[PDB]
């Protein structure tokens, strides 16, 4: 909350499972139709065997 | 020999025994014991000799309690040493006792054996003593 | 390593101590100048 110290780039982005926008720092080089910031990931919790 | 595992101080001022014992004048563990009629310092060597004597009697059936522990350091100067120049060479520990304090407690043996076993122990001690039986004792069940 | 100090600037002087290996810069404190009857800066000599 303090001005300054907090690092920037913390902007919303939707992760891909291989879609849910979540405020995260990691800004992968991509875009998508706003909610442009996108990151591609491997099997999420929807595809992990034991987790499902 | 009975002595503290460690002490805070190496020397101690020789105190003063004043009156009758107000603690440890009653039997708690056994049914028979011996109690002092004088005030005196009791040494560890005296206690070990008396305990071996009472344990030698009663064969191997019964339990003996020592109800005093020597925690008072004493010293002695020695021959050819004049007065002054500080305290002398250490000489072990003693336990100060006053009249009424119980020394040896015995249980597990009939009345006559206990009376005789503590008589042998009292004859190794520097103070005259007295036999005590607990007031709830039963002469018709031993 | 704690020596006498004399802060200056009749003249106005204040005597005090300080550790010469801990405080290595000359002392400079505001004190009351009796001659001027107001606070002025006194520096070590």
């Amino acid at each position: 909350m303090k001005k300054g110290i907090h690092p920037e780039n913390y902007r919303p982005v939707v992760f891909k499972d291989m879609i849910f926008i979540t405020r995260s720092t990691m800004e992968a080089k991509e875009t998508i139709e706003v909610t442009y910031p996108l990151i591609k990931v491997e099997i999420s919790n929807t595809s992990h065997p034991f987790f499902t | 020999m009975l002595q503290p595992k460690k002490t805070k101080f190496r020397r101690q001022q020789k105190g003063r025994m004043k009156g009758f014992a107000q603690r440890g004048n009653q039997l708690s563990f056994g049914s028979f014991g011996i109690k002092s009629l004088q005030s005196k310092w009791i040494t560890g060597r005296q206690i070990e000799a008396a305990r071996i004597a009472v344990t030698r009697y009663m064969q191997r059936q019964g339990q003996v309690w020592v109800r005093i522990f020597p925690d008072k350091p004493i010293t002695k100067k020695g021959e050819g040493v004049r007065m002054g120049k500080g305290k002398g060479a250490p000489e072990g520990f003693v336990a100060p006792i006053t009249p009424g304090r119980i020394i040896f407690e015995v249980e597990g043996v009939p009345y006559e054996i206990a009376k005789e076993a503590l008589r042998l122990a009292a004859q190794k001690l520097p103070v005259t003593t007295k036999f005590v039986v607990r007031h709830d004792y039963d002469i018709q069940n031993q | 390593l704690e020596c006498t100090e004399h802060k200056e600037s009749g003249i106005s002087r204040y005597i005090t101590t300080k550790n010469r290996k801990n405080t290595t810069q000359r002392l400079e404190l505001k004190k009351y100048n009796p001659i001027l009857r107001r606070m002025t800066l006194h520096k070590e000599i």
């Binding site: - | 009653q26 009249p99 004792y137 039963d138 | -």
Partner: protein
């Protein structure tokens, strides 16, 4: 279970009065409990000789002359350090209103099996019990016909009557 005691009135108090009392082979004594103040009176060494010097316990039926008649139990005996003679007694008044803690003898009444060899050992000689004064046994019998090997009967693992075993539960009342 019952003892007959009587005692004379006591008026003076202090170092001088008490020393003169025992000069006649008497004992100062007090009685207190529940409603009302205490009672100061005098008993004799002959009178209380069989009340205290005994393996038994009794409910003292006390008749203090000049004051009245009550029921009491032994609470505290004061002994001389050297002579081991009685110098003071206080009796707790007992009524049928609330329980009272007292310790009754416990007797190991045959031994279990062949037994481990002359053991049959009574360890805890007395057990604290709280109950109405007219519910306290004269004795605490136990039957011992099980576990002739290394065993122990605890204080908690026993139920006698409408008593209450306050005698430091999870302890050991017999063994071997």
């Amino acid at each position: 279970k019952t003892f007959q005691l009587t005692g004379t009135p006591r008026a003076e108090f202090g170092k001088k009065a008490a020393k003169a009392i025992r000069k006649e082979d008497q004992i100062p004594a007090v009685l207190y409990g529940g409603k009302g103040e205490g009672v100061n009176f005098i008993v004799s060494q002959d009178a209380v000789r069989n009340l205290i010097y005994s393996p038994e316990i009794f409910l003292v039926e006390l008749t203090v002359e000049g004051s009245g008649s009550y029921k009491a139990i032994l609470k505290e005996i004061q002994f001389h350090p050297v002579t081991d003679r009685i110098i003071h007694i206080d009796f707790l008044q007992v009524t049928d209103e609330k329980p009272v803690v007292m310790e009754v003898p416990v007797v190991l009444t045959h031994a279990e099996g062949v037994k481990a060899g002359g053991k049959l050992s009574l360890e805890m000689r007395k057990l604290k019990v709280k109950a109405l004064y007219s519910e306290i046994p004269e004795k605490l019998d136990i039957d011992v016909s099980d576990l002739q090997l290394g065993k122990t009967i605890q204080v908690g693992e026993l139920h006698f009557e409408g008593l209450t075993l306050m005698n430091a539960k999870n302890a050991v009342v017999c063994a071997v």
